[PDB]
Structure formats: structure tokens, C-alpha cells
Amino acid sequence: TLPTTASSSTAVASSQLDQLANFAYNVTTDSVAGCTLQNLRVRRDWRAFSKTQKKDYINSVLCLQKLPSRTPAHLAPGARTRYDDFVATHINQTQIIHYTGTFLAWHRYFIYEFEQALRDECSYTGDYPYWNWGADADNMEKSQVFDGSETSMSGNGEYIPNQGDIKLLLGNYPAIDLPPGSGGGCVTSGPFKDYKLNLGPAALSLPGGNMTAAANPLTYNPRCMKRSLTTEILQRYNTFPKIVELILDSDDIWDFQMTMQGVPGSGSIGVHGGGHYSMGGDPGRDVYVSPGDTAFWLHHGMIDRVWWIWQNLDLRKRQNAISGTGTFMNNPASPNTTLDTVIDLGYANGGPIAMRDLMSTTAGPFCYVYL
Amino acid sequence: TLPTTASSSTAVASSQLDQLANFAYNVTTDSVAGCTLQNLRVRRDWRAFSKTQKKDYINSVLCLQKLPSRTPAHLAPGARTRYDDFVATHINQTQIIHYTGTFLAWHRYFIYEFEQALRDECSYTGDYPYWNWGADADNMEKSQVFDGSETSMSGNGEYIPNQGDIKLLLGNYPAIDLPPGSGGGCVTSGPFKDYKLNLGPAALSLPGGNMTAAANPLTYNPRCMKRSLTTEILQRYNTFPKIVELILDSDDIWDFQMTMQGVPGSGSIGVHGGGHYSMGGDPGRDVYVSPGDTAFWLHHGMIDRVWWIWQNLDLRKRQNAISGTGTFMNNPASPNTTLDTVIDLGYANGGPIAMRDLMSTTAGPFCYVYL
Ligand SMILES: *[C@@H]1O[C@H](CO)[C@@H](O[C@@H]2O[C@H](CO)[C@@H](O[C@@H]3O[C@H](CO)[C@@H](O)[C@H](O)[C@@H]3O)[C@H](O)[C@H]2NC(C)=O)[C@H](O)[C@H]1NC(C)=O
Ligand SMILES: *[C@@H]1O[C@H](CO)[C@@H](O[C@@H]2O[C@H](CO)[C@@H](O[C@@H]3O[C@H](CO)[C@@H](O)[C@H](O)[C@@H]3O)[C@H](O)[C@H]2NC(C)=O)[C@H](O)[C@H]1NC(C)=O
Ligand SMILES: *[C@@H]1O[C@H](CO)[C@@H](O)[C@H](O)[C@H]1NC(C)=O
Ligand SMILES: *[C@@H]1O[C@H](CO)[C@@H](O)[C@H](O)[C@H]1NC(C)=O
Ligand SMILES: *[C@@H]1O[C@H](CO)[C@@H](O)[C@H](O)[C@H]1NC(C)=O
Ligand SMILES: *[C@@H]1O[C@H](CO)[C@@H](O)[C@H](O)[C@H]1NC(C)=O
Ligand SMILES: *[C@@H]1O[C@H](CO)[C@@H](O)[C@H](O)[C@H]1NC(C)=O
Ligand SMILES: *[C@@H]1O[C@H](CO)[C@@H](O)[C@H](O)[C@H]1NC(C)=O
Ligand SMILES: *[C@H]1O[C@H](CO)[C@@H](O)[C@H](O)[C@@H]1O
Ligand SMILES: *[C@H]1O[C@H](CO)[C@@H](O)[C@H](O)[C@@H]1O
Ligand SMILES: [Cu+2]
Ligand SMILES: [Cu+2]
Ligand SMILES: [Cu+2]
Ligand SMILES: [Cu+2]
Secondary structure (H helix, E strand, C coil): CCCCCCCCCHHHHHHHHHHHHHHHHHHHHCCCCCCCCCCCEEEEEHHHCCHHHHHHHHHHHHHHCCCECCCCCCCCCCCCEHHHHHHHHHHHHHHHCCCCCCHHHHHHHHHHHHHHHHHHHCCCCCCCEECCHHHHCCCHHHCCCCCCCCCCCCCCEEECCCCCCEEECCCCCCCEEECCCCCEEEECCCCCCCCEECCCCCCEECCCCCEECCCCCCCCCCEECECCCCHHHHHHHCCHHHHHHHHHCCCCHHHHHHHHHCCCCCCCCHHHHHHHHCCCCEECCECCCHHHCCCHHHHHHHHHHHHHHHHHCCHHHHCCCCCCECCHHHCCCCCECCCCCEECCCCCCCCCEEHHHCCCCCCCCCCEEEC | CCCCCCCCCHHHHHHHHHHHHHHHHHHHHCCCCCCCCCCCEEEEEHHHCCHHHHHHHHHHHHHHCCCECCCCCCCCCCCCEHHHHHHHHHHHHHHHCCCCCCHHHHHHHHHHHHHHHHHHHCCCCCCCEECCHHHHCCCHHHCCCCCCCCCCCCCCEEECCCCCCEEECCCCCCCEEECCCCCEEEECCCCCCCCEECCCCCCEECCCCCEECCCCCCCCCCEECECCCCHHHHHHHCCHHHHHHHHHCCCCHHHHHHHHHCCCCCCCCHHHHHHHHCCCCEECCECCCHHHCCCHHHHHHHHHHHHHHHHHCCHHHHCCCCCCECCHHHCCCCCECCCCCEECCCCCCCCCEEHHHCCCCCCCCCCEEEC
16 A cells, blocks of 8 residues: 655655655556557656766757757847757746646646657657656765766856855745855866856846846856755755655645745745755756756656656546646736646747646656656 | 824824825925926826816827827737837736836836826826825715716726625735625726727736636737726725825835735735725726726826825935835745836836936926825
8 A cells, every 4th residue: 555644764755755656657557558558658767877878868958959049039039059949938937837827737848848859859769867856865966967977967066165045035935044055156067067058047046145137038148057066955855755745745736736846934945946946056046047957857857757646646636636826926816727728838849738738647748657 | 293193084184194295295395406396397186187177188198099009019919009008018017016126116107108198299288197095985986087077087887786706816815805896897988988998908807706817918809998986995995094004104115015005915905906996897907907997097196196205204214215126026036126226118108217216206307296
């Protein structure tokens, strides 16, 4: 049988998670015959990628970072690459894709279409990778995603000493304080050391409490990607126990999505805010520009995975479950999201698509499972 | 001497307000010499306009509702008139002009530039009118702004019986419930009965709790202006006592602007939400499209007046006082508004202008006082 209450023990909570995942795997695989068992893709933990498989993915990303942008220049003047096309649409729609009813599904579609670009333009034929926070929550620096080696998404940034805390303001609420991490500057190694971040900053939190906001975040501001790896953040918000609490203690989609994102006032930023902010730097600390950090795709692989596990714990009730509205924290108010709500990624990839077609990983345009 | 504590008595609170206003008038007039006593314009209560003066203003508005729109068609396809130019920019910027640091100053500049259009394109040579809520708080229908006569901003809409309540959601907070008023449909008389509302709805609250949101609120949706005059709303939020509480019990700009707008969770929508929602209808109940209702300009004349009174109670401390950020309720987070923050009305009128130049009615582009 499955666990119903999350343990505080790291070792078991991991295996607790593993059981819940296998269950989710079972329901998904044996429910599939569009999507069939034959063309069912499997998304996999980055650790499970052999060296060359890691590099294949990385090279496909680098490829999208070389191919020219399709976005009409006058709409995103700072866009240069196909990768920017994805970053631009995210910055463009930030206000309607976080703390909305569409949060989970939009991101699921976002990473899927990113994947399609890798496959259709950059010859990627491997599996979509995800970053399992829990395994790295004691040492982010040793994460295979962030260790600075040739198979990381680059690693830490130039150490900058004595930086002030990050002070996160969700609305008018009291700030959540976070340490500045052990980096600060440009990433010093790894495949993306010469990657040029072109857009933003739109809302970049700085050590000290400041925030940098370009006049127009879609205009040209070429600079390095910065990181400040911050283990304390992961161990505060992204441990296996926190992951399993999120899954086991959320009886509806509202509680799920809110707990995952961090409910304002609780002093908590969830596994989702945890994973983003643990990267530090730029656009690591910019809610709008975050896809500009290459780790984003793996992070959201894991977000999608966690959502998919949760859905399968109760597929009758949860598969199509939606809650929230079309505006960030419903500010200003907007209508409830419904199964007919249409989302899109502008010029990044794919076309407009209704929520109903996004709710399942093995329906609509989707045919994948997480291992 | 001035009152420091608001009375609960309507008669005195009115005169309490009158004293505070004369004081504000005194400080403003005798501080002026750009702006001098010579070219100092006076803005006046609508009741103080003689019949022909009322009509002159109305005709100038009707004029802007006939002259063709300047907004690049591809940016606001639904725009037809110079009046739409103003409505379009408001819908366009709603998310950064309410519950922001720029709320008060942006609107002050917005109505000033509207006034400039009336004068420069529609030969208006009279005074800017404002709507004093307090005097009408017992019978909105008898308001000279809304009595349906030829000198109103049109009046009530076709009565629609048995409409459900309005259910206002500020974020995730519990709904504030309001009665549906005594209208519902198209305005039945007055100068604007054949006025065609072209934009929205963007976020239109409906009796019953529903909300109508066009896919693109800047596209073409020509329809009548609707109203449902609702006295109970004015007497709940816009009485002379409520006005004087707002002015006397707000010791800083944050408290002022928040109390005026209604702080979320308090079950109160302030004199500002009160004045808007008392109109009912469409775009009366649409925070984005509200300038589409012609009364908007008078309402915000009074908003500006109330702010101006408050500033002059303590001109040393309050004249340049700013608080808040660049995003609706700071969702998502943005940097603090500062005196260097630039605002603009797109294609409506005027150019970009910094907050510092908006803080005083007798500095920057401004040279007016309220009587
Ligand atoms: C609503 O607000 C947005 C944001 O301010 C406005 O977007 C702005 O649109 C204008 C016109 O497209 C852009 O100006 C520039 O015009 C020149 C032509 O002279 C063109 O070559 C440029 O590439 C660009 O189009 C401006 O970049 C853009 N601003 C931002 C920050 O995106 C929009 O106009 C507003 N909508 C309405 C109806 O006013
Ligand atoms: C960010 O989001 C906004 C809102 O979706 C996007 O605005 C959209 O811009 C496109 C392109 O200008 C508009 O499409 C239309 O294109 C035809 C040409 O085929 C033109 O004739 C039309 O007048 C119009 O320009 C579309 O109306 C507009 N959508 C809305 C709701 O405003 C914007 O493209 C996004 N920015 C980025 C970088 O993706
Ligand atoms: C998944 O299915 C397999 C194969 O039938 C079964 O052995 C295993 O116990 C299942 N796991 C869970 C958690 O249900
Ligand atoms: C922004 O303003 C608030 C109060 O108005 C202040 O407490 C806060 O520290 C400011 N933030 C920064 C980084 O200036
Ligand atoms: C943050 O903003 C404050 C206020 O302008 C400024 O004094 C300080 O230099 C800034 N800190 C840094 C170094 O980013
Ligand atoms: C305004 O100034 C006039 C003229 O000096 C004075 O008579 C009046 O008392 C003043 N009103 C207030 C409230 O200060
Ligand atoms: C929107 O959804 C919430 C709960 O998800 C519900 O309570 C509310 O009544 C809905 N509003 C409308 C008008 O459908
Ligand atoms: C409001 O929305 C609900 C849910 O779709 C619908 O059943 C009802 O007809 C709507 N009410 C009206 C008449 O606007
Ligand atoms: C197991 O290790 C985790 C970190 O991965 C801790 O959070 C937990 O308390 C236990 O020590
Ligand atoms: C004076 O009248 C006002 C309405 O204008 C009331 O709110 C007040 O209680 C007093 O009766
Ligand atoms: Cu996102
Ligand atoms: Cu994210
Ligand atoms: Cu407004
Ligand atoms: Cu208003």
C-alpha cells in the first residue's frame, strides 16, 4: 500500500516518494493503449543520463541558443535566438502564469514545446531530463545539474563575499529572508559559460533587498548568466520530506499548487520557489526571466513530475482538477480558469491550446511518463 | 483651527470637509507666484456649473467621442475615437496603476491630459468638473451627475428586476457583496444615450458573481453604456463622514491611498471603489474599462481633490510622499515607486513624465486648485 503521511526521515521519505512514483507510473502505463504504450516517451532523472546522453541534451540546448529568433523583432527587440523566443514569451506572460489556475498546465505545455524545439530543430532524440531536488538538498554544488563540469548546466558563479540577504516580497507581506549563496557573479565553467543572457532583468531580486527592473525587459541587455548556488535554500524548502508533504498533505489542486508555489504570508516559498532561488544570480532570482537559466527546464521537469504523481494518487478526482483565476494571485480579479481556458506560448513554439488538452500527460499533444 | 477627528454627523462632517478644503485652498493660492496666481485654473463642483457650462463640458466630451482615434489601429483595434484613446491606455495599464505607488499621481496626470484634449481639440474653455459624492450619498438618482437630464452624464439604465448581488473578489480574499442597483441595462436618457462603448469588457463583474472578460479587451465590441445606479453603495462608502475619516485618519500616504482604494480583507472598497461601483453596469463594474463611463472624469476629479486636500494638511511631509510599487498590490513584486518613476498615457495625450513632476497641482505641468 501507499504512504498517506509524510515522514520526517530523509531516507524513507525518498523511498516514500519512490513508491508514490511507481504507483503513478503503474496507473499511467497500464491505462495507455494518439497516445499508446508504443509512442509513450519516458522522462528521466538527470542522474540516470549517461555522460554522452547528458551532452546530447546540452548540445541541443546550445543549438537553440545559436539558431536565430523567430519572434517579430519589434515585439521582443532583445531576442536573438530560438532560446530567447522561449524566454521572451515567459517574461511576456509572467503575470498570467504564476499563482493562476493555469500555472501547472501552462508550464507543462511550455516545457513540452521546448522539448519539441530541441527535437525538431536541434536533432534531439533523447529523453526529457528532470532535476530531483531531494537528492541534492545537502550539497547543491555536488548536484549533477550544477557541479560546473562539462555535463552540468554550468555551476556556480564567481564568489562575491559579504553579500546581503535576499528579501522576497510576495505582495505587501513581510519579507522572506534568504542567504546570498556562495557565488554571485558570472558562471565560471560548464557548457554555458559563454552563453549570453539577452533579456531582462524584469524583476531581479538583489542581495541587500534591492530589485533591478529594466524599463522594457524584452529589449536588448546582453550579459552573462549569473549564479550563486545556495544549499541552505534547498534544505529549507526542497528536501524529500518537503516534497512528500507537498504530495501527501494536499487534498485538492488549490492546496497543491499553492503549497508548491509558497502561499504568501507563510514564510515559505515551496519546492518551486526553493528550486528557482537556490540557483541565485540572474535570472535565477527573477520570476519573469527564470527560463534564461538553463536549469529551469529540469526544475520544471520535476515540477511537472510532482504534479503528475499527485494527480495519479486520485486520478478520478484530480486528473482535470483546476483552481484559481487568470491573474497572478487574482490581482486584479479575473474569471476562474476553466477547462476551456486557452493558453499559448506566443512565438516560442506550438499553437493556442485549451486547458482540457493539457490536464493529462497521455492525452492531448502529450504522451509521456516520468521514471 | 482645523478638525483632527472626523464626526459621525453628516451635516458637520460636510462642513468639516469644507474647512479642510478652504485651508487647502489657502495654502495653495498664497504659495503660488510656470505656475502663477494669474494662470491658476480652478476646478469646481459640478453643482456649481450653470446649465450652459454643464452643456459646454458635455459637448466637449461628446466631441472627443466623435473625433477619430490616434492610437495605432494594430495596438487597439477596437478604438474608434479620441475618447477611446483614453480608455485604451487605461485598460492597457490597469495592472500598474491601481494599488501601486503611482496610483494617485497617474490618475492626476490622466485627467489633466483628458482636460487638455477637451481644450485643444474640442474648444473647451470652462473649468474641470468634479463629483462631490457626499452630497448625493442619500439619493444617487438625484445627483446632478446622474439624473438622466440633459445636463447629466446620462442617468440610470433600463431597470432589470431580480438581479443577483455583485460579488467583488480582491485577490483570494472573501467577496464583498453589493446590491445590483435600480438599473441594469443601457442608459435610457441624457447626452450619452447614443454613446457607443467600444472597448472591453476586460474584467466586468456581473450580478450573480460572474465576470465577463473578452479575449482581447482592446478589440472591437461596440455596445451601449450600461448603468445601475446604486444608492446603498454610496451611503456605505461615500458619505461625508467616510470622506473625512479618509482625510483625517490617514497619517501617511500608504494609509491614505489604501484606505481610499479599500484595503483587501477589510470588507471595504473606499470612496474610490464606492464611487465607481455605485454607477453599476458597464463599464461601471470593470476596473480596467471604467473611463468608458463618462462620470469617471468627475469621480476622479474628486479623488484628486481629496488627495490634494490631504496633501495640504501637512505640505512639508505630504507633498512628495510616495509609497507602494509598480505592480497591482505588488503582484508580482516590483521595485518601489520613486520620484524618478516615469509614467505615460501611451497615445491618449501628453508625454512620459516623472513622478516628481506630478506631486503638486501647482508645479510641473499643473496649475490648478480645487474649490
Ligand atoms: C500598452 O503598453 C505597452 C507597453 O508600453 C505598449 O507597447 C509599446 O508599443 C509601442 C508601439 O508598438 C512600441 O514603440 C515602438 O514604436 C516604434 C515605431 O516608432 C517601433 O519601431 C518599435 O519597435 C516599437 O514598436 C514600444 O516598444 C512598446 N513598449 C513596450 C514597453 O512594449 C503599447 O503600445 C500599449 N498599448 C496601447 C494601446 O497603448
Ligand atoms: C505578449 O503578449 C501579447 C498579448 O498576447 C502579444 O500581443 C499580440 O501581438 C500580436 C502581434 O502584434 C498581435 O497579433 C496580430 O498580428 C497581425 C499580423 O498578422 C496584425 O495585423 C494584428 O493587428 C495583430 O498585431 C495580437 O493582436 C496581440 N495580442 C494581444 C492580445 O494584444 C505579444 O505578441 C506578446 N509578446 C511577445 C514577445 O510574444
Ligand atoms: C506497480 O506495478 C507493479 C507490477 O504489477 C507492482 O509489482 C508494484 O507493486 C506496483 N507498485 C505500486 C506502488 O503499486
Ligand atoms: C521600499 O519602500 C518600503 C516602504 O515604503 C521600505 O520599507 C523598503 O525597504 C523599500 N525597499 C527598498 C529596497 O528600497
Ligand atoms: C540598493 O538601493 C539603494 C537605494 O538606492 C542604494 O543606496 C544602494 O546602493 C543599492 N545597493 C546596491 C549596491 O545594489
Ligand atoms: C483661509 O484664508 C482666509 C483669508 O485669510 C481666512 O479668512 C480663513 O480663515 C482661512 N481658512 C482656513 C480654514 O484657514
Ligand atoms: C470560481 O471558483 C471558486 C472555487 O474554485 C468558486 O468558489 C467560485 O464561486 C467560482 N466563481 C464563479 C462565478 O464561478
Ligand atoms: C454565470 O456563470 C454560470 C457558470 O457558467 C452560468 O451557469 C450562469 O448562466 C451565468 N449567469 C449569468 C446569467 O450571467
Ligand atoms: C535527512 O536529510 C535531509 C536533507 O536532505 C534533512 O532535511 C532531514 O532532516 C534529514 O536529516
Ligand atoms: C447623515 O447622512 C449620511 C448620508 O449622507 C449618513 O451616512 C449619516 O449617518 C447621517 O445620517
Ligand atoms: Cu514560469
Ligand atoms: Cu518556475
Ligand atoms: Cu484607473
Ligand atoms: Cu478609478
